[PDB]
UniProtKB/Swiss-Prot annotation, chain A:
Entry binding sites for Mg(2+): 80
Organism expressing this protein natively: Homo sapiens
Cellular component aspect of the GO annotation: cell body; chaperonin-containing T-complex; cytoplasm; cytosol; extracellular exosome; microtubule
Record's protein name: T-complex protein 1 subunit eta
Residues bearing the modification N6-acetyllysine: 55, 238, 308
PANTHER family reported for this sequence: CHAPERONIN (PTHR11353)
Presence of the UniProt keyword ATP-binding in the record: yes
Sequence positions that bind ADP: 29, 81-84, 152-153, 397, 482, 487
Lineage, highest ranks first: Eukaryota, Metazoa, Chordata, Craniata, Vertebrata
Consequence recorded when altering residue 367 to K: Found in a patient with developmental delay, intellectual disability, pyramidal and cerebellar signs, cerebellar vermis hypoplasia and hypoplasia of the corpus callosum; uncertain significance
Superkingdom of origin organism: Eukaryota
Name of the top EC class for this enzyme: hydrolase
Swiss-Prot record, chain B:
Annotated Mg(2+) binding sites: 86
Reaction catalysed by this enzyme: ATP + H2O = ADP + phosphate + H(+)
UniProt xrefs under Pfam families: Cpn60_TCP1
Covalent link location (Glycyl lysine isopeptide (Lys-Gly) (interchain with G-Cter in SUMO1)): 446
Protein name: T-complex protein 1 subunit theta
Binding site for ATP: 87-89, 157-158, 399, 486, 491
UniProt keyword list: Acetylation, ATP-binding, Cell projection, Chaperone, Cilium, Cytoplasm, Cytoskeleton, Hydrolase, Isopeptide bond, Nucleotide-binding, Phosphoprotein, Ubl conjugation
Superkingdom assignment: Eukaryota
Organism: Homo sapiens
Swiss-Prot record, chain C:
Annotated GO CC locations: chaperonin-containing T-complex; cytoplasm; cytosol; extracellular exosome; microtubule
Family statement drawn from the similarity comment of this UniProt entry: Belongs to the TCP-1 chaperonin family.
Residue positions binding Mg(2+): 79
Protein name, entry field: T-complex protein 1 subunit zeta
Taxonomic path: Eukaryota, Metazoa, Chordata, Craniata, Vertebrata
Pfam family, one: Cpn60_TCP1
Record-listed Phosphoserine modification sites: 194
UniProt record, GO biological process: chaperone mediated protein folding independent of cofactor; chaperone-mediated protein folding; positive regulation of establishment of protein localization to telomere; positive regulation of protein localization to Cajal body; positive regulation of telomerase RNA localization to Cajal body; positive regulation of telomere maintenance via telomerase; protein folding; protein stabilization
Disease: De novo genetic variants in nearly every subunit of the TRiC complex, including CCT6A, have been found in individuals with a broad spectrum of brain malformations, and clinical phenotypes ranging from mild to severe epilepsy, developmental delay, intellectual disability, ataxia, and other features of cerebral malfunction.
Organism: Homo sapiens
Amino acid sequence: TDSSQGIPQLVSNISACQVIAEAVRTTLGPRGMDKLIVDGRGKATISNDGATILKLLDVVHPAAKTLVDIAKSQDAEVGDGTTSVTLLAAEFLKQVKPYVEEGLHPQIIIRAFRTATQLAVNKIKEIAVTVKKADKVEQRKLLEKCAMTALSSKLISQQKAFFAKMVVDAVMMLDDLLQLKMIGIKKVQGGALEDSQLVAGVAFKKTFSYAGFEMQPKKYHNPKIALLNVELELKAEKDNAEIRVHTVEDYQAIVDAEWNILYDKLEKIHHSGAKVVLSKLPIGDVATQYFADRDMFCAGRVPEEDLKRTMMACGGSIQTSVNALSADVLGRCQVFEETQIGGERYNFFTGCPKAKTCTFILRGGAEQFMEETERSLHDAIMIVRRAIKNDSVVAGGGAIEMELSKYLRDYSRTIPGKQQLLIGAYAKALEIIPRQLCDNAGFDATNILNKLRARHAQGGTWYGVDINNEDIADNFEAFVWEPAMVRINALTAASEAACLIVSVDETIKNPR
Amino acid sequence: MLKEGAKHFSGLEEAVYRNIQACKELAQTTRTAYGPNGMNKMVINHLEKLFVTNDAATILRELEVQHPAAKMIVMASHMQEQEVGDGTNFVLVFAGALLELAEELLRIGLSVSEVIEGYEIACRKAHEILPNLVCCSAKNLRDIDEVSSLLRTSIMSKQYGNEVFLAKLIAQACVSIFPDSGHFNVDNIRVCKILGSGISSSSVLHGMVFKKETEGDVTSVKDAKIAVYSCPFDGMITETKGTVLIKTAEELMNFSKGEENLMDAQVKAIADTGANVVVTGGKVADMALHYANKYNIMLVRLNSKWDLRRLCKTVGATALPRLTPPVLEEMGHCDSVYLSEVGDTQVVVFKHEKEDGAISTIVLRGSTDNLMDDIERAVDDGVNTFKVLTRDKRLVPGGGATEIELAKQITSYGETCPGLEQYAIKKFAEAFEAIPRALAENSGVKANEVISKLYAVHQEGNKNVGLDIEAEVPAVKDMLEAGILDTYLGKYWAIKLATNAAVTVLRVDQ
Amino acid sequence: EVARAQAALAVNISAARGLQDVLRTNLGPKGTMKMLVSGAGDIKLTKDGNVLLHEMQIQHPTASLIAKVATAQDDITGDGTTSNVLIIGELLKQADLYISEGLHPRIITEGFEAAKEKALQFLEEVKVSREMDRETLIDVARTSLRTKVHAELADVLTEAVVDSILAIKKQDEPIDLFMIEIMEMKHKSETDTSLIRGLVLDHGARHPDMKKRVEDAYILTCNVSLEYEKTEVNSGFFYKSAEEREKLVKAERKFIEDRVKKIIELKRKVCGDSDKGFVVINQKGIDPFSLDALSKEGIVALRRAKRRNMERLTLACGGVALNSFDDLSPDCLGHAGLVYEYTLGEEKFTFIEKCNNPRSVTLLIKGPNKHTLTQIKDAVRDGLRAVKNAIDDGCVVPGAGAVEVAMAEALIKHKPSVKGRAQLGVQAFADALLIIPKVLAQNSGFDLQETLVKIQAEHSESGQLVGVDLNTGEPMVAAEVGVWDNYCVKKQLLHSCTVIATNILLVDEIMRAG
């Protein structure tokens, strides 16, 4: 049973934070410097935001664990700004670290973190511009300019406008969440990158070709969809087995009797109403015979997640038995069309009766073009979705943070003693996030930060650093438009996360 | 040693020096505690969570020491935890402070045994002047402001951000069902964590709160007596499996038929015996559910260990493993059983209305279960301070405002008596000064300034200090008139036990 | 591999010397309480010299030897065992100085023999007759308890101890070996100790309030079970067939039924009215069903009592202990004048007091169930053995090292045998004694020489056994205060010290042994 206490003990806890704050340092755009993180399970791992990998880490300090937990809190609510919270909390504590040595050990610190956080939130909300969806704009054209903000950063040329107006159409129709989960974007090999397709409903990326795959029908006008999490093949129901021998007909009989059981499975669901069979587990060679001959469509080897989207939108439901089951475990569409696009066979289910999935289908025909489009469209769908929920929009780029840092510099003058010092650390900490944007755009980060403060003392505007252009200028007039609300959440979560760590400086551990 | 026998780890140099320095380290966790504070101490223990506390009982039990001197005081703190709530921290800091002051005496040329004697004397004089420091008291316990002022001090000791809402809440939800005049129950009030929603969204519910979702129909009858079973379903017959799936097909038919007919009998036995609410910590199968819809029994899906525990203490219940039909013997004092959603989660609500053996629940709503564990310390101490077993609780100034008053009287009194005793009496004054020192350290300023300026204003019986800016520079705040009050009984046992603990441990040398 | 001659004596003196330190801070009331975690890791609170030697881990041959001789002293007096060690240590020290200059161990020993005879005869002269009154028993009781606990808690235990000894005169024992039942109660303070005349029972009925005041109690103490449930047994183990076990379950339950019935017939035969109660004490269970039936008849039936309760009841009450119930006359059953049930703490204790024909008293110690309640148990233990001695001897002297200076003074002046051989051990013997008074002064903070010259002079002028007032550590007359010592305490430090010394003194080799 271990016990540790002291002023150097406090210093320990902050030092741990820096280590996790470095893992996530920059991921705002697509520059920084990564190292592939491959696990001991023999899996290679990367993500598109650096907070994901950070969640997986197990920290051996409890004080460091608090900062892990607030990451999980941000990620679930907004789904953005998760990185931002780590940076502010850690950095605040960094400029406080040598202040503790001097005398800022006392619990008074917690009080100061509250005054700074409460003012700052209010200043955002007031400065932010409240704009309808019918002010002087279509609902789709407000969210067009907000969806562009993600798209311009990387790395997709002039198709970015076109894709933007498209990606919106899916989000409005579904809206009732702040997550991209019920949308998604599916890459397709081959085809035109000069247009892409917005499909209402679900689709499948690839179904493998089987014996009489083109002898199965590809079009239906009242497809009734059987969702099967099972399989039939030679290893799911046998078609080889030992028999007694004393006549030739014994041999015939055994193969005959086995083919019947596999034929029962498609028939029973077909007679309920099925003609479309969708399965994520493999379908074999023996399996596909019965289907090809019946002139009833089959599909095997389609992604597990994609099959689960099919359930919601068509009103189908999971099965575990395909024998003797209702027709109310089936979903419908009005259109089934199979068109082979590039090297992969593409199943499109659309005409969906309740349409609780709609999804953008992005056709490029590469690996290079498509991963950067997908990376940008993931964050596009986050900006537009959250613009319906909070209708206050403020400049990003860290432009507003530079204004808070101004505002708080003023405040530090009438606020007294040990608290003032705490406020000066808050102000310095706000500038870290834009410094990394300067490292990504390619500038001298300290030179830049100072020029934005000048136009926050000569107008109070929106001057900040762009990675969405890779320059310095107003971000409101550059259509770098993201909600007020991402910023509201990130401040309050960063203070909350902070106060806990500086307070603990007496840690009792048990390795029991 | 000189001996290959006579084992000691204390004695000589090590009694005088090492024991005291150890008491000092335990009591460092309470020189950041007691009243106004922003300290948080994180302690882990592999409990699959983070445990945040600013209570002495949980800190102490976690922490093991191999010396009898430091180990003995933890017991004295627990003793004051049973008889009263908040002030647990104050018991340990006092004993620990007095012992630092003691070692200095030993240095000069004073003997152990007179010093030991002079504390018993100082403790007796301090208690004798203590009911003459009553400045305010309750008379009605059904009045929310008079109860809440008392509560407030317990909450304060935890965080100085959650004093206002909670202190009102407990009194609102009742710990005044009992007369509290001969009799009080504290296992018929629990603090029940409901995950989800903010902590200002913490609510009043009367009688037993269990988180687990309700299934089936719900009852509202007065014939509803509680039957508690840990596991009454697991499948009434367990399988063996011979084809490594089932043993086998004709047998699977029988295993299901026998389950459905045995569960019919079991659930009909419950129905007949007058048990119309059954608490299942087992698993609700379709067959078991199908039966309880017919008989009209409120069904509680699941339970965990924590939920079972509160049923056995409150009800007079036992939790029996079952798969063969039982009958009532758990019984219950609960007539009414209602259904009400707290946290937007279906919660099972038990109630009956009476004074003695009557139930209440301070139920909380919180973002995480960690945030709820600290709040819980504030609330459970607030139930344990209520217990005094009078309705005039003889409130004395809370928050450490008494401490300087006691110290002034004691130092003067010391002068009057002669011999070596008196030095211990003076030290006894400066041990109370521990409390004003810890409030100063969090406040952000040195000890010299606060103790002098409290002394400067003479006899006041209000003066104590907060975490504020008002708490620093003029070092004067009113904690009589801020409605920061604690009970006479809580301060009594704190000072009493601490003096007894300091004397026994100063004696050791083995 | 041997320690011979000077090397053999060296080992003993060095050990005695470190030990002495420990058990001077246990001496008298001014000594200090001690705890062990060095014995096993668990928390013990103990303040007796013998006991503390057992609890620790002793490997040293000289420490062990002192602990063994200690054992005998502890049985008889239970006081003076804090002292045993002190006198041994100094006794050696004296010897050492002479040896180092140049002296043989054997001449030292001879002068010990001469020393011992004179010293014992001095006890006989100086002894002061006392009464056998309460007042005089109070003062043996209070000073001995004062050794083993505080001054505050000790004064409470003083009352309990003394009434018991008066009651033991009635039995006409000149000894104590009964009325020593120590029973513990569950409480939130330890500053109460209550006397209960008869017995106390660990658990009461599982059904409260049957008739919790019994005016006329006819105690059947039994120990056959009236509960054995519904369990399937055969000979107390599983058997191959269900049915064979079952058949026995019927007959066993049936046996119990008839025995519960005998309680119903017994109440009419002995009682006949509900103007009299009936007491049952069963050391084994009784059904909840059986209690309701018994209760309305005006019978209190106790369940889950101990074997120790049962033996005690049979002596005090005049009761019987039977393996049957049946229909028995009140001639066989014992009677108690009163029964009361007192609920305090988390466990309720049925008292069965004002027994006729007692020989057992119970001293009922309340406490929190910490080590403090074990501390008053072992204080109370040796306080019973102390007042036992007062009944043994006729004569009790004033103590506090009063006796010991008087005895030392008598030796210094003349040769007790008139030879120089004796004389070399005799100096050694006299200064060894002086440790006990001087050191009470040392604990307190009063210089040791100053009390020796004063205390000794005042003996000379007066003829009073002037003693030490413990708290000041300055002299005062030990008689008035109540700091007294029995004949047996001052006899048994003397005998133990001589015998133990002369076997370690006379070592010449210590050689290891498997």
